[PDB]
Design a protein around this ligand. Structure first.
Ligand SMILES: NC(=O)c1ccc[n+]([C@@H]2O[C@H](COP(=O)([O-])OP(=O)(O)OC[C@H]3O[C@@H](n4cnc5c(N)ncnc54)[C@H](O)[C@@H]3O)[C@@H](O)[C@H]2O)c1
Ligand SMILES: NC(=O)c1ccc[n+]([C@@H]2O[C@H](COP(=O)([O-])OP(=O)(O)OC[C@H]3O[C@@H](n4cnc5c(N)ncnc54)[C@H](O)[C@@H]3O)[C@@H](O)[C@H]2O)c1
Ligand SMILES: Nc1ncnc2c1ncn2[C@@H]1O[C@H](COP(=O)(O)O)[C@@H](O)[C@H]1O
Ligand SMILES: Nc1ncnc2c1ncn2[C@@H]1O[C@H](COP(=O)(O)O)[C@@H](O)[C@H]1O
Ligand SMILES: N[C@@H](CCC(=O)O)C(=O)O
Ligand SMILES: N[C@@H](CCC(=O)O)C(=O)O
Ligand SMILES: N[C@@H](CCC(=O)O)C(=O)O
Lengths: 651, 660, 339
């Protein structure tokens, strides 16, 4: 295998281009197109979308009806088709074309020397600044073929272009207005199997229109679990009554992959690697999407599927994609602030309801001064405050076996604090079972929980769990009698990599006062097992890929390596001093991934199977056997380990 | 409300009748029909099905084509219809009827003075002893109306008769051979909404045919989540070439409600109360059934629905239904032997797989000499045997706090036995959390009980880490149902629970089953017997398990409302002499329960099951489903909130169940 | 004329409500609904949308299949219907209801003492944290009627509720997931004449989900030239595995009219005056919208139109709407910089 090849990992590189329009001069337009397409080829792109009516210019009005213009358009089209014999990408080029009685506003789908299909715009705006019905006919419901350079090629709104050697890539094409009506051709296309939706746009620019284009491309890409590739007209279009901004953009399932400078001087491209496996995975999981298709079975089975062989490049062509280091921790500070606000409120409101339902039990929690319990204590306190409960009904315990932050935190919040030395009970228990270990660690971990549960019976409380999602993922907890067990776990949904940011978020908001903030800060400074289970930054990364998308190990390694191999590349969330910004080699990423698949798929499930209650937090998922993760407690991880042996280089 | 009314609890009483045939004499047949129907009326039946071609006799061949016969059939039908003005049940009577060009083999659905519909047989056998196509036309695909006694009434294979004041009762009718073809009219009818499927049969009798009729009525009632009411011809049919057996039967979702004497002298009826709520509940739950309907949407939306008002009796008319005392413990010894065999093998194989998957850990189990742990030890032993594991890899512990059966059993099986006194650890813990007992006060608290319960589990878990084993849970289904366990650190928790699916009422019969098979030898059997003798004679606070296991089954399988469960349990349990007891209830341990008691324990049940206990089931260790009634895994049969009140159930009991 | 009357100028006042859920207690839920609906009445609202499965609570799982729960739901529904004789707004209340073989996840459209229609959810998520297919049947393609308190009322995904004395107000109802699939029932409804699209949502909250709800409600309102009224479940839903944020919002042709506090303590409403003339005008001008309808003529002519008379208040009830002084000059500095 070629492990560094984006194409071998299910990416398809796509381009949205804005060329230089020369109105009423198809030769000139074709030349600009040819030159941009050659760039896309050099970039290893599989697809290159151009603006509405590329070969004539969108804005020429009744000049679209002139024989000499239409004849010149055909001539130029045929030259492009001939040039395309040598170009890698599928070109989607706009052109006014004669068919039957009229000219249609069409997108010509071109590939390796042939026209694959010709797709007419369905809805022609004839209102405000738009007069398209005057010159051009609507495409909705046209089928059949059209004769282009002595060949009959598929013509109509119902076409799909499927790469025979790259099945994740199935192209559908619509045109500008098409995406703005209640029931866009692209939405039926997605249900029928289209994964990459192209839009050629003319779209003169006005205040607020760029937002409208975004709103609709973004929502389409999200609602149809698809990439949406959009190209609008720019410099060169007539400014008789309108101006043009050249916007290009590429969306993927609601996320912006790329966009280009608005009002550029010169031509611009958006180029991005679309993850066809992502779309595959989203669709495999959201059964209601298939249900929608079956309900519109007639609409969706009637698409004609045109095949082509892409034969993309096999080598290292980089990865034109922003892979964030912390799938659970957004690098953008505004976005991170928002996530924290949500995570915190989820945790709190999860706990408020349990407490309301139990008519306000005391809250029993083991506080050790570490990140997890510190944060849980804070969550508990807020929940109690919001429910008008005295903080003294929170019972915090230090349980020393064989830290100062804990008592300082508890005194500062003003909950009830208490120490119980479990050492003697442990000594008694170790002696009673005849121990001279994991047994040694576990006797203490167990007795901590045993004590808390009993205190909870005694004092009318519930025991608050504090184990985080990353520990659930790797089975890094003592199961049953031990920290795995509790009456309600507020941390169950929060991965370890997010925890430290919640604590800062709490400090930064300042709600608990200056003294509490200082202790919390101390906890952070002090606290920041990764020796045996690996760095949580890496295991949280793999967890997200597995839990959300079920990606194979080699795909996960590829992604993590692009995100993590170079500390200077990409973005870091706030709060990583340059001394704690590590980079990881492939060898490391591989290593921790072996530990991960073995622990996640095989070892740890029985511990998640009997999990106490607690709220889902991340869109990446949570690990409740009653919600996001239903799996066997008795399965081997052989095939994932084997996939790593076979597909991931040793370094 | 009227609490003792079967009808007010969702039952509909149905009859399958076999009359006296007088061939070629419709007046005589009608007179027999009228007299049987009056009986059904007196019984408060809603429905009375008669044999194929009732009014003429099935067996009269070309006499069916005689004008005078056909004319007399019509006259007799009209007299029935007139007499039916005063009759409670819907009558389904067979009759050869003229329509368009031919006579159809029909079933006339009659009610309170009117004909609701006429249903022609769809498939007319013309092979072997059957010549139906010679005299009569196929009904499949006939629709429209037929003119009967100056009224136009629905005619066709596509009809449903729905009780407007009793929505669980939607009738479809088919005739004999109809149920024998790959795609019977009744199967489409059920997808369309029919819940009670009638079959009028002629069906001359031959060796093995009664089995065939059963196979097909039973499977239809099961596959269609319906009652199936069946009536065949008997005495009086011609014996020119055939004999007749008069078989009648009533099925419900695969179970036999009732059947009559074969080859009777005189007329016979099967009468039974069909539970429409049971059918409702099964259908509510089996979504693939509704999926089937949607797939045959065109077929199923094209049914015509004819409404009638049954207005059944409101009072106490008893309950013609066998309600078993132990929904989990079949009274029939053969069936009970079979269930035990299955329960045991499920438990064992569930554990064998966990052990294989863990490369054969030692099995750690707390044995106290009680039923549950005794049984688990046995299960564990057999699992180890089948996997060729030494029994000494089973580590049994007695964990005395503040019985001989346990050590005797362990020594006899030859597992590794050991005692660990948890009292000192408990004393230390109780003192450390400052509990009054540690300072003398005799305060036998929930905390006091729980410190010991918890420490047992704590010890076993640590032993399991120490010695390379897993801890076997032993808590049974009835304890899961009621939250009768110590949660988390405590007996609720384990590595694998082989008893999780087994209700308490079944456990004692598993143990006997094990003894009875004898597989473990005479010494082991003697100790097991001793465990039974000792342990059978907390049911003070949570109630008798016979009652709670009863309510559990109703709730878990059907979601029945409390008053419905009280009605059922009262009919099963109020009288110790009535109904059957499984094997092994000496007459001194055959209690009966009053309504007051049944009510009382049901309040405790709904509160504990719907509200209190769910959190303890929510974090449940692994273990195999056993009963068709269901199991309580939050990953399987029971998905429910851990933080809900049971107010509405408690209220339903207040409102609907009399105080005594 | 009454010149200060929002209703006489083609506004229709609408509410999205988040009540207090008491799981498995329909009487309690109905009481909270009744109390919120009375507020909406006092505000002169024409429409009040509640969260998914309002009368039972969304999150109760297999408890939805218990006879006593389903029976209590019906009883409570009938009381609401009776109370609604005296209430101005159309209520849209969620309820698990028996029909044919199964329970449907339904929205009951209630008005002045009668049920106008019962609309089943079309797409039932059964993936990740969602298990709806286990307990409930899909509504897509169900038509006919359902029997509710001794009346047969329209049942199905194809319903429109049109105010006979206020023609700009034509209601269509869908449920949570319905707006998330490529071809939402609401998009066909708009082409057929719906101008106000309601969504009852359960929607447990997770990081980023509020944005997803916004993205999809906003885009729907814009793509369908319509008001979109959205109500999600909050306090009271089970937190066995999930938390709930009580978000309510009202969109109009891509613009946010109103939204409510997320994670509120107590019940919240979004109330706004929707401009039916605005939607009328947008639609009159964008001929491609009508072209889309003609292309899906079969889909769009098959809607059943249920009529009702709103008879809204004629007087001055203010105007719950932000009318900017400078239509050409946005008051928000970030937006103005961009323009
Ligand atoms: N940071 C934390 O949250 C935390 C807390 C405690 C321990 N730890 C770490 O993890 C370790 C805990 O050790 P552990 O996981 O070996 O102890 P554990 O008791 O949680 O898990 C092993 C136990 O479960 C049983 N088991 C294993 N697989 C099973 C399966 N499929 N089904 C049923 N039972 C199964 C084993 O026989 C054994 O009794 C510590 O030594 C330490 O390294 C971390
Ligand atoms: N034979 C057996 O199987 C067995 C064994 C031990 C005890 N028991 C019986 O059961 C009793 C156990 O008592 P118990 O059930 O009160 O103790 P428990 O510890 O099992 O349960 C109560 C504990 O759970 C918490 N809790 C209650 N509802 C909760 C919820 N909805 N969510 C989260 N946490 C919740 C309470 O705050 C308390 O800490 C004993 O007294 C005894 O009668 C039976
Ligand atoms: N020394 C301690 N005192 C009180 N609580 C503790 C102590 N150690 C651990 N805990 C609790 O048990 C959990 C286990 O932490 P750990 O095994 O160290 O990652 C912590 O998150 C606390 O909730
Ligand atoms: N005295 C005991 N000795 C050994 N095991 C016990 C003892 N008491 C309880 N157990 C274990 O805990 C389970 C719960 O029983 P109990 O709490 O006594 O009703 C039993 O089935 C045993 O597995
Ligand atoms: N329907 C949009 C189209 C916007 C565009 O073409 O970019 C309009 O108002 O014209
Ligand atoms: N098809 C069956 C008919 C049985 C019956 O009609 O009862 C046969 O072999 O004759
Ligand atoms: N289709 C969305 C639904 C989100 C919601 O229900 O709010 C999902 O991922 O579950």
């Amino acid at each position: 295998m070629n492990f560094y090849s984006a194409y071998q990992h299910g990416f398809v590189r796509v381009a949205a281009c804005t060329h230089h329009t020369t109105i009423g001069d198809p030769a000139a337009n074709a030349a600009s197109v040819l030159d941009m397409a050659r760039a896309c080829h050099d970039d290893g792109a599989a697809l290159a979308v151009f603006p509405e009516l590329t070969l004539s210019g969108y804005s020429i009005e009744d000049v679209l009806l002139q024989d000499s213009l239409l004849d010149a358009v055909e001539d130029a089209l045929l030259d492009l088709v001939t040039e395309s014999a040598d170009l890698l990408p599928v070109l989607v080029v706009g052109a006014p074309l004669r068919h039957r009685h009229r000219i249609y506003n069409t997108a010509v789908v071109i590939h390796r020397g042939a026209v694959l299909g010709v797709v007419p715009k369905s809805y022609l705006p004839t209102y405000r600044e738009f007069y398209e019905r005057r010159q051009m006919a609507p495409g909705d419901g046209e089928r059949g073929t059209i004769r282009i350079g002595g060949a009959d090629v598929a013509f109509g709104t119902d076409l799909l272009f499927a790469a025979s050697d790259l099945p994740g890539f199935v192209l559908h094409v619509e045109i500008c207005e098409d995406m703005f009506v209640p029931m866009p051709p692209s939405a039926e296309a997605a249900l029928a199997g289209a994964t990459v939706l192209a839009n050629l746009s003319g779209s003169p620019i006005t205040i607020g229109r760029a937002e409208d284009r975004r709103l609709l491309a973004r929502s389409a890409s999200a609602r149809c679990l698809a990439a949406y590739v959009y190209a609008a007209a720019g410099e060169g279009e007539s400014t008789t009554d309108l101006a043009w901004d050249g916007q290009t953009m590429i969306w993927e399932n609601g996320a912006l992959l790329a966009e280009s400078e608005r009002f550029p001087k010169g031509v611009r491209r958006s180029v991005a690697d679309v993850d066809t496996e992502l779309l595959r995975s989203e669709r495999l999981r959201m059964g209601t999407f298939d249900d929608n298709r079956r309900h519109h079975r007639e609409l969706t089975e009637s698409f004609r599927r045109i095949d082509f062989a892409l034969d993309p490049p096999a080598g290292d062509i980089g990865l034109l994609r922003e892979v964030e280091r912390f799938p659970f921790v957004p690098a953008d500070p505004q976005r991170l602030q928002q996530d924290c606000y949500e995570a915190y409120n989820i945790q709190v409101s999860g706990l408020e309801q349990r407490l309301r339902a139990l008519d306000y039990p005391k809250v029993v929690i083991g506080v050790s001064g570490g990140l997890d319990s510190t944060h849980a204590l804070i969550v508990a306190t807020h929940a109690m405050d919001r429910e008008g409960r005295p903080r003294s009904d929170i019972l915090a315990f230090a349980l020393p076996g064989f830290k100062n932050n804990a008592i300082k935190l508890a005194r500062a919040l003003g909950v009830t604090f208490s120490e119980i030395d479990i050492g003697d009970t442990a000594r008694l228990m170790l002696h009673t079972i005849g121990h001279p270990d994991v047994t040694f660690e576990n006797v203490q971990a167990g007795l901590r929980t045993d004590y808390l549960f009993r205190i909870a019976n005694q004092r009318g409380g519930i025991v608050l769990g504090t184990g985080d999602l990353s520990e659930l993922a790797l089975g890094w907890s003592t199961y049953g009698v031990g920290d795995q067990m509790s009456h309600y776990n507020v941390n169950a949904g929060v991965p370890k990599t997010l925890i430290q940011h919640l604590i800062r978020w709490v400090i930064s908001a300042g709600e608990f006062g200056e003294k509490v903030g200082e202790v919390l800060q101390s906890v952070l400074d002090t606290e920041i097992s990764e020796a045996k289970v690996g760095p949580f930054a890496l295991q949280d990364f793999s967890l997200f890929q597995v839990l959300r998308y079920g990606f194979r190990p080699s795909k996960i390694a590829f992604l993590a390596w692009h995100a993590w191999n170079d500390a200077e590349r990409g973005n870091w969330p706030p709060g990583f001093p340059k001394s704690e910004r590590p980079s990881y080699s492939l060898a490391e990423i591989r290593h921790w991934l072996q530990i991960f698949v073995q622990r996640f798929y095989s070892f740890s499930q029985f511990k998640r199977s009997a999990l106490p209650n607690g709220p889902k937090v991340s869109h990446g998922g949570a690990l409740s056997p009653r919600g996001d993760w239903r799996a066997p407690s008795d399965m081997s991880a052989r095939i994932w380990l084997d996939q790593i042996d076979r597909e991931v280089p040793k370094g």
